[PDB]
Design an enzyme around this catalytic site. Structure first.
Site, PDB file in Angstrom:
ATOM      1  N   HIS A  68       0.938  -1.317  -0.118  1.00  0.00           N
ATOM      2  CA  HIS A  68       0.226   0.026   0.250  1.00  0.00           C
ATOM      3  C   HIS A  68       0.726   1.370  -0.238  1.00  0.00           C
ATOM      4  CE1 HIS A  68      -3.243  -2.894   1.381  1.00  0.00           C
ATOM      5  NE2 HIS A  68      -3.735  -1.913   0.266  1.00  0.00           N
ATOM      6  N   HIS A  72       1.744   1.659  -5.670  1.00  0.00           N
ATOM      7  CA  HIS A  72       0.110   1.191  -5.696  1.00  0.00           C
ATOM      8  C   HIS A  72      -0.753   2.131  -6.159  1.00  0.00           C
ATOM      9  CE1 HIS A  72      -3.542  -0.734  -4.921  1.00  0.00           C
ATOM     10  NE2 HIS A  72      -3.808   0.003  -3.693  1.00  0.00           N
ATOM     11  N   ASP A 107      -5.137   5.707  -0.979  1.00  0.00           N
ATOM     12  CA  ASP A 107      -4.796   4.849   0.187  1.00  0.00           C
ATOM     13  C   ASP A 107      -3.756   6.027   0.856  1.00  0.00           C
ATOM     14  OD1 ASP A 107      -5.794   2.354   0.328  1.00  0.00           O
ATOM     15  OD2 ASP A 107      -4.523   1.387  -1.207  1.00  0.00           O
ATOM     16  N   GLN A 269      -5.529 -17.646  -3.413  1.00  0.00           N
ATOM     17  CA  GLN A 269      -5.498 -16.651  -4.540  1.00  0.00           C
ATOM     18  C   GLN A 269      -6.919 -17.378  -5.156  1.00  0.00           C
ATOM     19  OE1 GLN A 269      -4.047 -13.824  -5.512  1.00  0.00           O
ATOM     20  NE2 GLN A 269      -4.221 -13.799  -3.276  1.00  0.00           N
TER      21      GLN A 269
HETATM   22  C1  LIG Z   1      -4.234 -10.317  -5.298  1.00  0.00           C
HETATM   23  N1  LIG Z   1      -5.151  -9.675  -4.459  1.00  0.00           N
HETATM   24  C2  LIG Z   1      -5.807  -8.269  -4.888  1.00  0.00           C
HETATM   25  C3  LIG Z   1      -5.308  -9.833  -3.089  1.00  0.00           C
HETATM   26  O1  LIG Z   1      -4.858 -11.026  -2.792  1.00  0.00           O
HETATM   27  C4  LIG Z   1      -6.134  -9.019  -2.253  1.00  0.00           C
HETATM   28  C5  LIG Z   1      -5.940  -7.525  -2.126  1.00  0.00           C
HETATM   29  N2  LIG Z   1      -6.260  -7.109  -1.395  1.00  0.00           N
HETATM   30  N3  LIG Z   1      -7.061  -7.875  -0.667  1.00  0.00           N
HETATM   31  C6  LIG Z   1      -7.926  -7.640   0.466  1.00  0.00           C
HETATM   32  C7  LIG Z   1      -6.751  -9.246  -1.358  1.00  0.00           C
HETATM   33  C8  LIG Z   1      -7.694 -10.291  -0.755  1.00  0.00           C
HETATM   34  O2  LIG Z   1      -8.687 -10.377  -0.178  1.00  0.00           O
HETATM   35  N4  LIG Z   1      -6.873 -11.447  -1.037  1.00  0.00           N
HETATM   36  C9  LIG Z   1      -7.070 -12.601  -0.252  1.00  0.00           C
HETATM   37  C10 LIG Z   1      -8.482 -13.184  -0.001  1.00  0.00           C
HETATM   38  C11 LIG Z   1      -8.720 -14.258   0.628  1.00  0.00           C
HETATM   39  N5  LIG Z   1      -7.785 -15.216   0.756  1.00  0.00           N
HETATM   40  C12 LIG Z   1      -7.463 -16.169   1.462  1.00  0.00           C
HETATM   41  C13 LIG Z   1      -6.005 -16.583   1.222  1.00  0.00           C
HETATM   42  C14 LIG Z   1      -5.490 -17.718   2.062  1.00  0.00           C
HETATM   43  C15 LIG Z   1      -6.156 -18.849   2.459  1.00  0.00           C
HETATM   44  C16 LIG Z   1      -5.551 -19.969   2.857  1.00  0.00           C
HETATM   45  C17 LIG Z   1      -4.198 -19.876   3.161  1.00  0.00           C
HETATM   46  C18 LIG Z   1      -3.372 -18.828   2.577  1.00  0.00           C
HETATM   47  F1  LIG Z   1      -2.163 -19.110   2.443  1.00  0.00           F
HETATM   48  C19 LIG Z   1      -4.297 -17.846   1.907  1.00  0.00           C
HETATM   49  N6  LIG Z   1      -5.402 -15.581   0.678  1.00  0.00           N
HETATM   50  C20 LIG Z   1      -6.322 -14.715   0.350  1.00  0.00           C
HETATM   51  N7  LIG Z   1      -6.112 -13.660  -0.361  1.00  0.00           N
HETATM   52 MG   LIG Z   2      -7.253   0.905   0.633  1.00  0.00          MG
HETATM   53 ZN   LIG Z   3      -5.670   0.479  -2.881  1.00  0.00          ZN
END
Ligand SMILES: CN(C)C(=O)c1cnn(C)c1C(=O)Nc1ccn2cc(-c3cccc(F)c3)nc2n1
Ligand SMILES: [Mg+2]
Ligand SMILES: [Zn+2]
Length: 313
Positions: A68, A72, A107, A269
């Site tokens: 952030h 970004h 941000d 992801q």
């Molecule tokens: C790519 N991108 C934009 C982002 O990832 C992004 C950018 N801002 N936010 C808020 C996100 C976001 O919500 N991403 C997430 C959402 C749910 N997730 C669950 C897991 C996960 C689960 C089990 C094990 C493990 F290792 C990882 N990884 C995740 N990444």
């Molecule tokens: Mg934000």
């Molecule tokens: Zn942002």
């Protein structure tokens, strides 16, 4: 007046594409932004000297966090530039003025922590702003910088136009709270499917601008795969630091924030693409057909994460 920004040939061509990466030369990002405002908005939209002073104070108010950060800000602004340039006629003069600024500021003064962490820590910002905690802060920091001497890039707007552009900015920044995206996209899905979506209705435009903001904010998932994969590293560097801070408060963090669960990232992801990213770009392409290349790039990245899981990379 007669002073255009120009980019080297490769940047001049590729900056028009949704999947452009702004590169590792930090010193070129202000000129890239001014280039985008001049083609998006016009050479007359802002006084160059005030705009340059504004950009540099905005940069100074982003912190040295893994994700952030200033890179970004400029990356989210470029995605908005590509949406605006592919939808020439759909947006007002004030919207083109407000939306690139909103993206650069969205941000401001981020600390690398979620709204949930601020609330669990009992940060003073969580008493000042009970929902969309960091997003109300980012809008507060935007107004602060706009009020510095020599930084009112909107000086030539009437009182009521200035009030309208700060309201476009405020809503656009609040809409980057992902907690608000789920309901916004669902309402847009119903409105499009029942044919009630009306771009002359201001509350409908506000929703469509909100979704544009989510789409720009998540735009790491719409890059070429080497960019997407390396950006994910920075995203998790922050998540995992927040998880460490959760463990210091005596709270088990969610799996995406627990570095002990690094081996499950690929399956995480995959879940995020199916629950957030694909729905987001799908609904955006229904409303704004020329944004389809964002959906196509997202689907290409989802298929790359499926390849990681199958051990094919
Ligand atoms: C790519 N991108 C934009 C982002 O990832 C992004 C950018 N801002 N936010 C808020 C996100 C976001 O919500 N991403 C997430 C959402 C749910 N997730 C669950 C897991 C996960 C689960 C089990 C094990 C493990 F290792 C990882 N990884 C995740 N990444
Ligand atoms: Mg934000
Ligand atoms: Zn942002």
């Amino acid at each position: 007046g007669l002073m255009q920004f120009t980019l080297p040939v490769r940047l001049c061509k590729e900056i028009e594409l949704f999947h452009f990466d702004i590169g590792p030369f930090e010193n070129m990002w202000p000129g890239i932004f001014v280039y985008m405002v001049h083609r998006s908005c016009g050479t007359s939209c802002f006084e160059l000297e005030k705009l340059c002073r504004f950009i540099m104070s905005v940069k100074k108010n982003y912190r040295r966090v893994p994700y952030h950060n200033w890179k970004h800000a400029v990356t989210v602004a470029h995605c908005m530039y590509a949406i605006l340039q592919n939808n020439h006629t759909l947006f007002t003069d004030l919207e083109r003025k407000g939306l690139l600024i909103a993206c650069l500021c969205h941000d401001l003064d981020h600390r690398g922590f979620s709204n949930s962490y601020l609330q669990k820590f009992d940060h003073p910002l969580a008493a000042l702003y009970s929902t969309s905690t960091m997003e109300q802060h980012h809008f507060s920091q935007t107004v602060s910088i706009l009020q510095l001497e020599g930084h009112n890039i909107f000086s030539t707007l009437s009182s009521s136009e200035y009030e309208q552009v700060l309201e476009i900015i405020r809503k656009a920044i609040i809409a980057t709270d992902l907690a608000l995206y789920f309901g916004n996209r669902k309402q847009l899905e119903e409105m499009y499917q029942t044919g009630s979506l009306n771009l002359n209705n201001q509350s409908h435009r506000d929703r469509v601008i909100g979704l544009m903001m989510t789409a720009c904010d998540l735009c790491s998932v719409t890059k070429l795969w080497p960019v997407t994969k390396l950006t994910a590293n920075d995203i998790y560097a922050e998540f995992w630091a927040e998880g460490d801070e959760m463990k210091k408060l005596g709270i088990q963090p969610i799996p995406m924030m627990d570095r002990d669960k690094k081996d499950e990232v690929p399956q995480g992801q995959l879940g995020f693409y199916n629950a957030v990213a694909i729905p987001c770009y799908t609904t955006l392409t229904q409303i704004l057909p020329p944004t389809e290349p964002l959906l196509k790039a997202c689907r290409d990245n989802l298929s790359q994460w499926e390849k990681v899981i199958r051990g094919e990379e």
